[PDB]
Nucleic acid binder design. Structure first.
Lengths: 42, 102, 48, 387, 431, 201, 121, 51
RNA sequence: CGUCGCGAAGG
């Protein structure tokens, strides 16, 4: 069960970084400080 | 316990085995499932049945959780056929485009 | 007073409802087998 | 063939132009503006900061310009050229907002009210060196003015005798808005709403011949606004919620008379029709005020969302036909909406126009001039052909 | 010039002839009912006899086809060839086919009409040479397998060239490509000449009028923000709105009403053409629905006037005509309906003209002014004309009744009008 | 008024109008004739234009004479309605000349046979930084053109002729080959009007 | 609107709409009802805000049931166009879930709002 | 059938119909040789030359 | 009164 739990944490951080890397290429007037220019997606 | 489910799984509620084998290998997940035998995604033609399967799953979620969660309705189907009219003119205004350059 | 008359003329002007690109593409679904008066007051509904 | 219900066919064969194109319209043609550029209004004398406020003299041909370079100039403007008349320079103090003021009764005062981020505002008198006064004394309420960063100027008839005098109105810090006296500098009253005062605007409404009651409309930061008259003591006569709108940032009323176009005769006052509350999500709700009289929760006549980022300056046309939205965030961020049909003008604000980072906009009272001041330190001047 | 061009000219000039067996089967397998493998073995007498049965069924449901059973569907017409005769006879047979097609344009939901017209498609080669009358006579059924079959059989004339990606494609063409076909005005002139030929033959019906109206309102909607294209497109739609209004059926009457009201809201027309269009739609009012539709188009088309004259006096030769075709009664009931379409400027010009041209029924202007809402410059203008009226004639009791109504509401406006003209003491001394 | 209308007498109708062939100020359309048997018209005003306009054959094969196409443009010749201010000879061949007019327009005229008298179009090239152009977006013409300069040393590789306008703070170039404005205007960097341009041979 | 159980007051509505504005700034929320139920089933939602302004309220009140099963805090707000303009979308949204990130820059105001929501049951 | 295939940019033309009356062969004195159907618009061999 | 890049109704 503990090995299941560390697999959960590891897959969570992998999905975290991969979803951030996918989200970084959508759109937005971005700038590395990671924040977006406040304008609503029309 | 069907109303407590999102529009995406109301879309793909049928063909889950092709869904999960497509997820656990590298393929592309299906789009109709059990709603394919409805009367409107057969009316559409092309990948218009894919787009209509998504919008009809969303309106099925609306209508379904309304008449599963309300406790005062008259059972006349009012937002049902309203959503039918909205799905129908959505279908018409998306089939009316012609991606062939005239 | 004349400027107030002209400014009252341009204040007393109600909100029109314009026409645009897809203002009447919805007519092509219920185009078939509808009486002409029903089509006409449908067009007046889309306008007003 | 010949030897010589047909009415419109015969006159189709007669004429071959099919619009009443001439001056026999008196209204703006919708969805197609008719607008020319002019010479740069800051050409004869360069500026050095962002033009933080523009205004016009309500009768004279003077365009007043002030910014963060702690100076304020006043140009005399026309088509082919425009020159500087005077240019006062206040050391130590910037000016966040600066504006003309003419008294309603005598029409021979011509004060300038200039306020920065400090605690004082400066009052200049104009009759042609020159002297100024330093309004710096809140009388009873010194812990409610962090700054004089935003103010307005408005008339008031005192409702037991017709001693029409001016009033400056300051943004508070908690929820306050103080009013003052324009000439002397007494405190008169301070009204207060909850949340944060974000902005406010001044309505007028006449009561009889030569007698008018003003109304201060002030927003929350949430969307429920208070409108209270202040020709008596300032207590609330109506409070109503914006239908929607969360982060609202500016409100401007008008169509009749307001700060950008006051009157000179007292009986030339006019009840303002249109009201325009603009958010930070780009949205602008605008209402009429012939159906939002006593509704207490009115519907927006239009909900524009045409420009994206946070709007700062929205002004009216002096006769109430053209609203101007202007967001001070992104480049080329100004639009004009035709107000009676609430359409958006398509042809003018295109990418071949050098609006820049627009940070002030101001209409002329009668010429139809339109001044836009951007961040680079200039102000361009368009002319609307219709007026 | 190009020899290839001068030969393609004679190719399109002699497409309707068979000079070997391959071109004969290519020119014969084009059929409206059957496919290629069966239509390539049909002798002419077979399709002629089943088409004669089809014409007889169509004749016993419609009494204007015995002339065709005498002339063009005759027994000798299976041996009459097309291109062996003289050009006068080919012109006569050409407008014979045109008369047949715009007679049987309203019957295409029937297998008898399909099997009847299949004969002269197969024999008289109207799938090649009398092409455009076929196309823009059966254009209105564009969502139909008969139209998909017509479009797969025919070759496209150069006007209809934006249909050319629907040959051999089992999706029927769309409403948007129908509007893109109606957009360019050099198709539009041809369609209007077809439409007025159909009007003068009096075969206008409630399906193709509906289709023509929906196409015209969507063309106007496509050019909603194109001032030059609308200025070029007025004297086509307006001219056949006129010669559609000159007909008698209520369908084509209020179809012309519909294109008129959408064009008036599309752009601000001139005051004189608004007045003449009002006189035209008013001088030929017959039926019951024509009354209600003409009233709504008069009200909206007169409301869209932004400029002086917009509340002026409508003249006498159309005002007495309006009083003839519309009573002052039931104008009250149209005002008393609940939804209240915007009619303020026309009601104002109606009040000013009933004040200045009739001056004997002022209870009516009192009643309708009491029951409509009105705008302030209009009520100032009508009380200014009412003061002119009160000082040109003697103050009767109904006149002082609606004047004391105008005192009881908007005291400041009537006092400002009297300050523009004289004094309220002299006015009360008059009344 | 400048306009030219085609009436059709078999239908008492208007086939097509044609707006502003010749400008109204110089007289509008003075003489506009058909040609005997031919479906081309020849129009000339008083503003030194001379155009011809062909009628197309009809587009519908059956109906024919009721859908008449609008008349297309065709061959034209043209001066510039006002006396020219400056004269230059482009090539060493004595073949093409450049006329800087007084109606704020630059033309290239021929000397052999007049088939190629053409205006150099004032569509400014884009500034090379990646950003948008300078000058007016609306096609109003340039200022009055005072003094120009001309050589044929490296034609076509870059900007060939330069000129100096009336009370304009810079002096701008053109290109003789592409027959339009070049990229780079040269400011005089002293806040003065430019009066005398020249080029190295 | 009787089935609209807990809906916030004026000041609490204002502070949660400012924190959902900052959430849309930092891209830490998922918007829309079906997206809300997706992130609720996969169990990332800090809390749920929902707009009691739609013509059925039963289009949203199906997620309260699994929200009570999963003990997540949830609260109503009387204006869906306010939800839209505060969430940063030109259409009126219905529901919005705020996803979980302990390494945020708005963690403390999110948690103070979460306590102010879970206190009124 | 009464055709006129008028061509001007090559020289004074010359005719030869085929043995049966189907195909036509025309020849300009400049360089033009065209073999073509004439009752059908089927130009099946055009060739310019320079002799 | 100590307080805090270009761009005349498109490219």
């Amino acid at each position: 069960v503990k090995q299941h739990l560390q697999r959960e944490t590891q897959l969570k951080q992998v999905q975290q970084r991969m979803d951030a890397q996918r989200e970084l290429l959508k759109k937005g007037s971005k700038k590395k400080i990671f924040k977006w220019k406040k304008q609503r997606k029309r | 316990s069907l109303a407590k489910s999102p529009a995406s799984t109301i879309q793909i509620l049928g063909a889950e085995k092709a869904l999960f084998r497509a997820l656990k290998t590298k393929h592309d997940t299906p789009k109709y499932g059990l709603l394919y035998h409805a009367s409107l995604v057969g009316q559409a033609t092309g990948k218009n049945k894919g787009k209509i399967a998504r919008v009809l799953a969303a309106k099925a979620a609306v209508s379904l959780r309304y008449d599963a969660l309300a406790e005062d309705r008259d059972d006349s189907g009012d937002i049902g056929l309203e959503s039918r009219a909205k799905v129908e003119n959505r279908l018409s205004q998306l089939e009316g485009r012609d991606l062939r350059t005239t | 007073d004349e400027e107030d008359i002209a400014l009252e003329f341009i204040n007393g002007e109600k909100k029109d409802k314009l026409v645009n690109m897809n203002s009447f593409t919805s007519m092509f679904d219920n185009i078939q087998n509808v009486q002409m008066d029903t089509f006409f007051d449908r067009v007046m509904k889309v306008l007003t | 063939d010949e030897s010589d219900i047909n009415a419109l066919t015969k006159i189709l064969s007669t004429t071959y132009n099919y619009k009443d194109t001439l001056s026999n319209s008196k209204l703006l043609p919708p969805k197609k503006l008719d607008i020319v550029r002019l010479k740069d209004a800051n050409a004869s004398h360069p500026s050095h900061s962002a033009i933080q406020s523009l205004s016009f003299h309500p009768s004279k041909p003077l365009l007043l310009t002030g910014g963060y370079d702690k100076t304020l100039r006043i140009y005399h403007i026309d088509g082919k050229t425009n020159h500087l008349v005077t240019s006062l320079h206040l050391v130590g103090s910037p000016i966040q907002t600066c504006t003309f003021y003419t008294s309603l009764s005598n029409q021979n005062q011509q004060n300038i009210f200039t306020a920065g981020r400090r605690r004082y505002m400066h009052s200049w008198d104009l009759s042609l060196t020159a002297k100024i006064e330093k309004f710096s004394r809140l009388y009873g309420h010194e812990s409610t003015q962090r700054s004089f960063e935003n103010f307005k100027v408005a008339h008031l008839q005192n409702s037991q005798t017709n001693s029409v005098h001016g009033i400056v109105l300051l943004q508070g810090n908690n929820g306050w808005i103080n009013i003052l006296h324009s000439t002397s500098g007494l405190w008169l009253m301070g009204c207060k709403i909850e949340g944060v005062i974000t902005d406010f605007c001044i309505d007028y409404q006449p009561i009889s011949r030569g007698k008018f009651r003003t109304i201060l409309i002030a927003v929350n930061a949430y969307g429920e606004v208070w409108e209270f008259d202040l020709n008596k003591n300032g207590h609330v006569i109506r409070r109503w919620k914006d239908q929607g709108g969360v982060g609202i940032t500016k409100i401007q009323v008008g169509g009749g008379t307001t700060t950008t176009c006051p009157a000179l005769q007292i009986s030339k006052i006019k009840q303002n029709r249109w009201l325009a509350v603009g958010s930070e999500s780009g949205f602008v709700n605008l209402y009429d005020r012939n159906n939002a009289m006593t509704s207490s929760t009115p519907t927006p006549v239009a909900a524009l969302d045409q420009l994206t980022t946070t709007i700062s300056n929205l002004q009216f046309s002096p006769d109430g036909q053209i609203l101007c939205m202007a967001s001070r965030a992104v480049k080329d961020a100004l639009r004009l909406v035709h107000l009676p049909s609430c359409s958006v003008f398509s042809n003018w604000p295109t990418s071949g126009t050098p609006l820049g980072k627009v940070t002030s906009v101001a209409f002329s009272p009668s010429g139809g001039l339109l001044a836009v001041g951007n961040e680079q330190g200039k102000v361009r001047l368009w002319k609307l052909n219709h007026y | 010039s190009s020899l290839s061009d001068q030969l393609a000219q004679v190719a399109s000039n002699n497409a309707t002839v068979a000079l070997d067996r391959k071109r004969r089967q290519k020119l014969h397998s084009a059929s409206l009912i059957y496919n290629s493998k069966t239509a390539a073995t049909q002798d002419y007498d077979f399709i002629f006899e089943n088409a004669s049965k089809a014409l007889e069924e169509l004749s016993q449901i419609e009494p204007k086809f015995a002339i065709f059973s005498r002339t063009l569907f005759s027994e000798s017409s299976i041996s009459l060839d097309r291109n062996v005769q003289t050009k006068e006879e080919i012109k006569d047979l050409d407008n014979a086919i045109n008369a047949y097609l715009l007679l049987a344009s309203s019957k295409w939901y029937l297998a008898p009409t399909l099997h009847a017209t299949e004969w002269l498609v197969r024999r008289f080669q109207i799938h090649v040479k009398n092409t455009e009358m076929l196309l823009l006579s059966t254009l209105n059924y564009y969502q139909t397998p008969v139209f998909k079959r017509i479009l797969s059989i025919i070759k496209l004339p150069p006007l209809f060239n934006c249909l050319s990606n629907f040959v051999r494609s089992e999706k029927p063409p769309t409403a948007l490509t129908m509007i893109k076909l109606f957009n360019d005005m050099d198709f539009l002139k041809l369609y209007t000449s077809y439409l007025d030929q159909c009007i003068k033959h009096n075969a206008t019906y409630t399906n193709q009028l509906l289709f023509t109206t929906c196409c015209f309102i969507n063309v106007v909607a496509f050019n909603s923000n194109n001032d030059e294209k609308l200025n070029q497109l007025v004297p086509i739609l307006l001219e056949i709105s006129a010669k559609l209004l000159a007909s008698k059926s209520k369908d084509c009457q209020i179809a012309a009403h519909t294109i008129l009201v959408v064009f008036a809201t599309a752009l601000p027309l001139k005051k004189t053409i608004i007045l003449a269009a009002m006189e035209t739609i008013l001088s030929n009012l017959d039926a019951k629905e024509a009354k209600h539709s003409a009233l709504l188009t008069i009200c909206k088309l007169f409301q869209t006037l932004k400029g002086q004259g917009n509340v002026d006096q409508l003249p006498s030769k159309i005002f007495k005509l309006f009083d003839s075709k519309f009573d002052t009664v039931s104008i009250l009931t149209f005002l008393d309906k609940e939804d209240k379409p915007v009619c303020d400027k026309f009601i104002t010009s109606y009040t000013r003209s009933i004040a200045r041209y009739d001056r004997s029924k002022l209870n009516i202007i009192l009643s309708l002014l009491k029951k409509i809402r009105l705008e302030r410059y209009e009520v100032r203008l009508i009380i200014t004309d009412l003061i002119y009226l009160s000082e040109i004639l003697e103050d009767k009791s109904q006149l002082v009744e609606l004047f004391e109504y105008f005192i009881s509401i908007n005291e400041d406006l009537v006092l400002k009008c009297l300050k523009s003209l004289g004094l309220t003491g002299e006015l009360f001394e008059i009344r | 008024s400048g306009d030219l209308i085609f009436y059709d007498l078999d239908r008492r109708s208007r086939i097509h109008v044609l707006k502003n062939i010749h400008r109204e100020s110089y007289g509008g359309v003075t003489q506009a004739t058909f040609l005997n048997g031919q479906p081309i018209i020849v129009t000339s005003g008083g503003d030194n234009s001379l155009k011809e306009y062909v009628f197309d054959p009809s587009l519908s094969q059956g109906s024919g004479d009721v859908v008449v196409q609008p008349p297309r443009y065709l061959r034209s010749r043209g001066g510039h309605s006002q006396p020219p201010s400056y004269i230059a000879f482009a090539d060493s061949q004595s073949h093409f000349m450049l006329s800087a007019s007084k109606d704020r327009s630059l033309w290239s005229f021929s000397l052999r046979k007049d088939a190629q008298s053409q205006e150099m179009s004032q569509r400014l090239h884009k500034k090379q930084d990646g950003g948008r152009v300078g000058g007016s977006t609306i096609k109003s013409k340039f200022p009055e053109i005072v003094a120009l300069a001309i050589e044929n040393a490296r034609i076509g590789e870059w900007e060939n002729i330069i000129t100096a306008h009336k009370d304009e703070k810079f002096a701008r170039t053109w290109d003789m080959r592409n027959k339009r404005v070049g990229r780079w205007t040269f400011d005089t960097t002293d806040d003065g009007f430019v009066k005398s341009v020249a080029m190295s041979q | 609107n009787p089935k609209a159980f807990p809906l916030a007051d004026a000041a609490l509505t204002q502070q949660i709409l400012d924190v959902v504005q900052q959430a849309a700034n930092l891209r830490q929320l998922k918007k829309g009802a079906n997206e809300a139920t997706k992130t609720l089933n996969r169990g990332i939602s800090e809390f749920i805000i929902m707009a009691a302004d739609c013509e059925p309220i039963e289009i949203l009140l199906h997620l309260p049931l699994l929200c009570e099963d999963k003990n997540v805090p949830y609260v109503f707000v009387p204006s869906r166009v306010a939800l839209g303009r505060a969430c940063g979308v030109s259409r009126p949204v219905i529901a919005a879930s705020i996803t979980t990130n302990d390494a945020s820059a708005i963690k403390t105001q999110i948690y103070a709002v979460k306590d102010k929501i879970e206190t009124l049951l | 059938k009464a055709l006129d295939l008028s061509l001007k940019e090559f020289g004074p033309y010359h005719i030869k119909y085929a043995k049966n009356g189907t195909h036509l062969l025309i020849t300009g004195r400049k360089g033009h040789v065209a073999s073509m159907d004439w009752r059908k618009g089927q130009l099946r061999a055009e060739l310019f030359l320079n002799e």
